[PDB]
Amino acid sequence: PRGGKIVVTVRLWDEPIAAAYRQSFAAFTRSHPDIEVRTNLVAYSTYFETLRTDVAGGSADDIFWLSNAYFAAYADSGRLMKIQTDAADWEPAVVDQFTRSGVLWGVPQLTDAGIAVFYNADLLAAAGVDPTQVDNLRWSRGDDDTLRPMLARLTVDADGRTANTPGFDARRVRQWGYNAANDPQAIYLNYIGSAGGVFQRDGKFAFDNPGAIEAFRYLVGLINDDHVAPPASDTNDNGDFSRNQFLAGKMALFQSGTYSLAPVARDALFHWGVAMLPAGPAGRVSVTNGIAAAGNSASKHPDAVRQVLAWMGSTEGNSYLGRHGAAIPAVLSAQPVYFDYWSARGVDVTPFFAVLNGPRIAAPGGAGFAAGQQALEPYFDEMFLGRGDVTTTLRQAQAAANAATQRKLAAALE
């Protein structure tokens, strides 16, 4: 029989990406035939709880995915290999999310990239707007704003009147300008970062601050006063509403991430493209998130783990994760396979990546986060419906969100 290979295990939570890794590792083992890599797919819902007990019990895989909201505890407690290499070919946003105490604690694998603005070029042309104009847009609570008049021109009622025109009837809107809504990823986290505010800090909700107040007041205005985005009752409990209106030819600008590329490309019958995120008072600040693979410091085969991590961080190894156009390599030299997948389909994905070259805001998360996000949602729904006031809602919602998180964490300790 042939020689026994050293077996390295890799843990993750995403089924299609697990399938791409299996392809990547088959290629690794052809050139490194002394090592066999096995993937271990564990469901996301219990991933971090099960990792914590496996690592504590000395039964964790050799390599495992981490997110920004959970890596620190592992790094601080010596559970992770230091990643000792230059980071120049790795997405900086992802490197930054796994750097602690001056050390990088995982090999960047995937990025969400940034948020951008899908546009219906036929509706822009109908309004006399060139697609290039959508890259010049600025939102502001002050007189320097240019987003609001653009959105008003792109919002039209059944009689053909735009949102800026006397006699416009918001009850009879047939086409919206935009998708402002109670939507953290596509909308409000970007508005908060673009106003210099935070959403989460040190594991707690922290969105009751001046930057966030400005962001939410602007969004409440777009929806309830300008009528350039759908009423909040259409979007508060219905995360696909705006994408569905965009696909139906009823929305000019649709701000979203690369997660909307596949459904838009599959169904849109009109001419469409992607433009930059609008700049706010602190600049164009997008939400982003990344995933890195950490090496288990307790591995029985550390040299093999280091070889497998070098492969995973390489052009060839990481290209496998992007070649179906469904996930974005964090290795910069591997990103062309994702760009080329999309450009073959007529989509230039540049704006999702260009926005990362600036200030950013992290996607929030962490232990007990889901409980707190669930708690704030009814308060945010009323705010986006134009009821009460932004300041009093944010105060109350933050207290409710933190209380729900803390209960969940207390229940876990006991």
Numbering used by the authors: 34 to 447
Tell me what the authors wrote about this structure, in their words.
UspC from Mtb is a 441-amino acid protein that has been previously identified in bioinformatics analyses as a putative active importer of carbohydrates across the inner-membrane of the Mtb cell wall. The uspC gene forms part of a putative three-gene operon, uspABC, of which uspA and uspB encode the membrane-spanning subunits of the transporter, while uspC is a homologue of ABC transporter-linked solute-binding proteins. The fold of UspCNt follows the architecture of periplasmic binding proteins for bacterial ABC transporters, consisting of two subdomains or lobes that enclose the putative carbohydrate-binding cleft in the centre of the molecule. In conclusion, our data strongly indicate that Mtb-UspC is a carbohydrate-binding unit of the essential UspABC transporter system, with a substrate preference for sugars containing an amino group at the C2 or C3 position.
UspCNt readily formed crystals in vapour diffusion experiments using a commercial sparse matrix screen. Phases were determined by single-wavelength anomalous diffraction data to 2.6 Å, exploiting the anomalous signal from bound iodine ions. The structural model was refined against a native dataset (apo tetragonal) to a resolution of 1.5 Å. The UspCNt structure determined represents the ligand-free form and the model comprises residues 34–441, plus six additional residues of the partially ordered C-terminal affinity tag. UspCNt crystallized in two different crystal lattices. The tetragonal crystal form (space group P41) contained one copy of UspCNt in the crystallographic asymmetric unit (ASU), whereas the monoclinic crystal form (space group P21) contained two copies. The subdomains are joined by a central flexible hinge-linker that is localized around residues Asp145, Thr321 and Gly379. The molecular surface of UspCNt shows a prominent cleft between the two subdomains, which is characteristic for periplasmic substrate binding proteins of ABC transporters. The cleft is lined by several aromatic side chains, which affords the potential to form π-stacking interactions with carbohydrate moieties.
